[PDB]
Ligand binder design. Structure first.
Ligand SMILES: *[C@@H]1O[C@H](CO)[C@@H](O[C@@H]2O[C@H](CO)[C@@H](O[C@@H]3O[C@H](CO[C@H]4O[C@H](CO)[C@@H](O)[C@H](O)[C@@H]4O)[C@@H](O)[C@H](O)[C@@H]3O)[C@H](O)[C@H]2NC(C)=O)[C@H](O)[C@H]1NC(C)=O
Ligand SMILES: *[C@@H]1O[C@H](CO)[C@@H](O)[C@H](O)[C@H]1NC(C)=O
Ligand SMILES: *[C@@H]1O[C@H](CO)[C@@H](O)[C@H](O)[C@H]1NC(C)=O
Length: 497
């Protein structure tokens, strides 16, 4: 286990400094015997996923906070965690020397790092691109004879995805999302702004756009990559907004419903890519449950839709119970998945705050809330950005868990990286959320899950300044006596037999 090299940039915590010859890492799991628990601890004060071990006791007495596992109370199975291979993320990763590149990719994808198993791939350009392009910019090419991947895919994104896959010991699921269609399929003839597909679902424009999904999946397959899922459109509501500056393609929920039932669903189902999952919405969770009711109460759209993808940007408006909770109650067999998050887009937010503990706590708080309301996965946005929070052709810069400094062949792992790793490292695909109750009112955020191998994992986040002593009870093993320091996050692991 190679320790964090801390550096302060004047914010609430430190970054971990990595370069060509040094990056912090973990040792392989030792799997401690029954009656012993593992603790991974990160703190604002500087601890970075530090391992300790403790005993499990047969008995407990006291008035302190007790959290009780309810292993019989079974909820959602986890798909996984990861981030987005944008043009910007690829340009930043490839600006490092090869050994620094490999330590960045190992930080995310290896067992010596945090075990990411999801990669979101934009279908052509987004704002985190240095130029605007689609795969079919030759005008009025309804045949899509001139559909091709440019070097952003063939030289940047695809080779980095292959390298990530090879470093990962877990199977990695790829998720594709489009921002815009070719401009000649759009009402406004532009990559951005208020504009939809021309015409109506079931017509030549919509059939062409559905076939474009199949051509993308064919082109990626020529490069030996297969997708787990695609979304119906990135943030479809954004294309309904006058002057929207980012690549977009506007759909009402009715438009998405009919596009899926008539065009996208049947087109994917009648392709070699029929096993690729389709996710609807890919948008702010305040749009639930309405968007789910509009799409999923139509059997001709419902039969194609595997899940509902959500973005976190307006979560302050949208209580989880009224959105995720209500959507799970009405549509319990349609999985919910968090497909995009980042801090810093808002005009008042500094784009990049190197070492921000607040930004880390935003991530872990969101992941815990999502898991407590039936969500099966959580996806970061750009895997890496430069210290300006780009590149970005619209100059809408944001933060990333890893910041690359090309001038020093150095990258910085922020608190967001460690807060995400407290889940991604320890909650593999197939883990199941289980019950966890508190003995009294408390300021902690906590979630319990069972690993496929039956072992327990509990994440405890303390967003308060105050140390909170607490006990965890598992009826199969006994009591963990621990303490949740102010501004900390813990992951607890233990065998149950
Ligand atoms: C990539 O990042 C690495 C981590 O920051 C950089 O390594 C640091 O490199 C400096 C410059 O050589 C080292 O400092 C020197 O340290 C030695 C003492 O060495 C011994 O003790 C230190 C702890 O004090 C220990 O880290 C070493 O293993 C040795 O046991 C002094 O003699 C010098 O006066 C000077 O202070 C750092 O120790 C070193 N840290 C680590 C953790 O390796 C590396 O240089 C970066 N590479 C590039 C090219 O940017
Ligand atoms: C521990 O738990 C058991 C429950 O079977 C209880 O009967 C026993 O007296 C407890 N031990 C102590 C020291 O309280
Ligand atoms: C588009 O495709 C056809 C046939 O493969 C080719 O002859 C034509 O010149 C291409 N157009 C452009 C603009 O590259």
């Amino acid at each position: 286990a190679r320790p964090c090299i801390p550096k302060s940039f004047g914010y609430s915590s430190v970054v971990c400094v990595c370069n060509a010859t040094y990056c912090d890492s973990f040792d392989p799991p030792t799997f401690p015997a029954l009656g012993t628990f593992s603790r991974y601890e990160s703190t604002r004060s500087g601890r970075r996923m530090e391992l300790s071990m403790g005993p499990i006791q047969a008995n407990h007495t006291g008035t302190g906070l007790l959290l009780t596992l309810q292993p019989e109370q079974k909820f959602q199975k986890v798909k996984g965690f990861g981030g987005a291979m944008t043009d910007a993320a690829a340009l930043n990763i490839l600006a490092l020397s090869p050994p620094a590149q490999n330590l960045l990719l190992k930080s995310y994808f290896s067992e010596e790092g945090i075990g990411y198993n999801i990669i979101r791939v934009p279908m052509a350009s987004c704002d985190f691109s240095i130029r605007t392009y689609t795969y079919a910019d030759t005008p009025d090419d309804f045949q899509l004879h001139n559909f091709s991947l440019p070097e952003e895919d063939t030289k940047l994104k695809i080779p980095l995805i292959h390298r990530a896959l090879q470093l990962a010991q877990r199977p990695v699921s790829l998720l594709a999302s489009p921002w815009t269609s070719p401009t000649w399929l759009k009402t406004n003839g532009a990559v951005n702004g208020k504009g939809s597909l021309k015409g109506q679902p079931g017509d030549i424009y919509h059939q062409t756009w559905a076939r474009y999904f199949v051509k993308f999946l064919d082109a990626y397959a020529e490069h030996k990559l297969q997708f787990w899922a695609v979304t119906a459109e990135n943030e479809p509501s954004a294309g309904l907004l006058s002057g929207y500056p980012f690549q977009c393609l506007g759909f009402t929920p009715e438009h998405q419903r009919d596009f899926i039932a008539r065009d996208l669903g049947p087109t994917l189902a009648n392709s070699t890519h029929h096993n690729v999952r389709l996710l609807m919405l890919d948008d702010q969770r305040l749009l639930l449950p309405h968007w789910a009711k509009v799409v999923l109460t139509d059997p001709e759209a419902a039969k194609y839709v595997h899940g509902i993808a959500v973005h976190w940007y307006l979560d302050f408006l949208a209580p989880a119970k009224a959105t995720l909770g209500e959507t799970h109650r009405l549509f319990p067999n349609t999985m919910l998945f968090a497909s995009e998050a980042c801090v810093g887009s808002k005009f008042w937010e500094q784009s990049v705050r190197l070492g921000s503990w607040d930004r880390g706590m935003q991530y872990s708080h969101s992941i815990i809330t999502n898991l407590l309301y039936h969500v099966v996965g959580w996806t970061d946005w750009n895997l890496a950005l430069n210290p300006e929070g780009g590149p970005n052709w619209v100059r809408n810069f944001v933060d990333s868990p890893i910041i690359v400094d090309i001038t020093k062949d150095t990258f910085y792992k922020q608190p967001m990286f460690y807060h995400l790793g407290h889940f991604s490292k320890f909650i593999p695909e197939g883990s199941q959320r289980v019950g966890l109750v508190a003995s009294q009112k408390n300021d902690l955020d906590a979630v319990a899950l069972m690993h496929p191998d039956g072992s327990a994992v509990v994440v405890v986040l303390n967003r308060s300044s105050k140390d909170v002593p607490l006990t965890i009870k598992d009826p199969a093993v006994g009591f963990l006596e621990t303490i949740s320091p102010g501004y900390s996050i813990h992951t607890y692991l233990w065998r149950r037999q």
